[PDB]
Amino acid sequence: GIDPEKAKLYQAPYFEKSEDEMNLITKLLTHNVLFSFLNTKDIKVVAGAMQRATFKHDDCIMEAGQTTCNKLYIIQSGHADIIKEGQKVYLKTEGTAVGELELMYDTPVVATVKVCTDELIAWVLDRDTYRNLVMGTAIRRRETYIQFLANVPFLGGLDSYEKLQLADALSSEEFSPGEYIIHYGEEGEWLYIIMEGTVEVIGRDADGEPTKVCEFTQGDHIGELEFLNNHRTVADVVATTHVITAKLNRRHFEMCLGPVIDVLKRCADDPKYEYYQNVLKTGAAQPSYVD
Numbered sequence: 001g002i003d004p005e006k007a008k009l010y011q012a013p014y015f016e017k018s019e020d021e022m023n024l025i026t027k028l029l030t031h032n033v034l035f036s037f038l039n040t041k042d043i044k045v046v047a048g049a050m051q052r053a054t055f056k057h058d059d060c061i062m063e064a065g066q067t068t069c070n071k072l073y074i075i076q077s078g079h080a081d082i083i084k085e086g087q088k089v090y091l092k093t094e095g096t097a098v099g100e101l102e103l104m105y106d107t108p109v110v111a112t113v114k115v116c117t118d119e120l121i122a123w124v125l126d127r128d129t130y131r132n133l134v135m136g137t138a139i140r141r142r143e144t145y146i147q148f149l150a151n152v153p154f155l156g157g158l159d160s161y162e163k164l165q166l167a168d169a170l171s172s173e174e175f176s177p178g179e180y181i182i183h184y185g186e187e188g189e190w191l192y193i194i195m196e197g198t199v200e201v202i203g204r205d206a207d208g209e210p211t212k213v214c215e216f217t218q219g220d221h222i223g224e225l226e227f228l229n230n231h232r233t234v235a236d237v238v239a240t241t242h243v244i245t246a247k248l249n250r251r252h253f254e255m256c257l258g259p260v261i262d263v264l265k266r267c268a269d270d271p272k273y274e275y276y277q278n279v280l281k282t283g284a285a286q287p288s289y290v291d
């Protein structure tokens with residue numbers, strides 16, 4: 001990819017944006033996994049470089065085999081089918097991207113992208129800005145996680161593409177024994193998948209004192225309950241050994257884990273979550289919403 005010392009000398013194009021346009025576009029970017037590790041300044045540079053395009057039902061945004069696209073489209077509204085060898089294989093919806101496979105891996109269009117709503121509105125980024133300012137360590141990050149994610153039970157229903165979309169939004173964090181991964185009573189912004197080690201979940205008894213609920217270990221996840229039910233954290237999660245986690249921000253939860261939300265909701269039937277069911281029944285938490 002692009003030499004990082006040279007990427008610093010790249011100036012993206014700027015197409016003047018109103019404040020309202022900037023707000024709209026940056027919200028799309030901050031919830032799309034391709035931009036997960038860009039800072040605010042760089043998000044806004046990328047937004048400034050984008051241009052709007054619209055399409056109608058049955059238009060092809062790109063067609064398998066084309067070498068003349070080389071653009072990244074982030075969907076504001078509308079849906080499109082991904083068509084391989086005449087078969088619909090995936091549905092792209094609002095906030096998602098098309099064209100990233102070709103830009104990341106430098107190949108002609110792999111699949112046809114065909115609009116299936118009445119209209120579709122997208123924001124479009126050029127290849128050079130994507131390669132110089134966005135792509136970064138995307139391939140290395142995917143290498144860091146894909147083999148692990150292929151072995152995680154709750155992700156078994158995701159295909160390779162979807163597992164890699166999750167990987168795009170992950171970073172790693174390690175904890176020594178006794179360090180708190182999650183504290184009770186906080187906004188609850190982070191979901192952790194345990195790559196190694198064991199944790200304990202600590203609730204509160206009727207007198208308000210800490211009480212151990214259960215343990216989790218490699219392959220398990222913590223932090224999803226607040227994301228599902230929009231409340232502040234209701235337990236501490238503490239490392240009981242050295243722990244290595246993969247970490248996902250709440251802003252990427254819908255895009256990355258949307259397809260497994262019904263799997264995550266199965267915790268209601270798991271005896272390890274009896275304590276939480278009582279939290280919900282008695283209303284023992286206050287709200288917290290995604291930013």
Ligand SMILES: N#Cc1cn([C@@H]2O[C@H](CO)[C@@H](O)[C@H]2O)c2nc[nH]c(=O)c12
Pocket residue numbers: 062082084089090097098099100101102109110111112113161
């Ligand atoms: N092969 C393939 C796929 C291509 N795409 C998309 O189509 C655009 C044009 O190929 C890509 O830049 C993606 O955005 C896929 N999306 C979900 N699952 C898939 O398997 C594929």
Ligand SMILES: N#Cc1cn([C@@H]2O[C@H](CO)[C@@H](O)[C@H]2O)c2nc[nH]c(=O)c12
Pocket residue numbers: 182201203213214221222223224225226233234235236237272273274275276277279
């Ligand atoms: N109340 C409660 C519980 C909380 N958690 C976890 O702690 C994180 C922070 O609350 C959650 O996002 C879960 O990951 C629980 N895990 C198992 N059983 C439980 O009853 C609870």
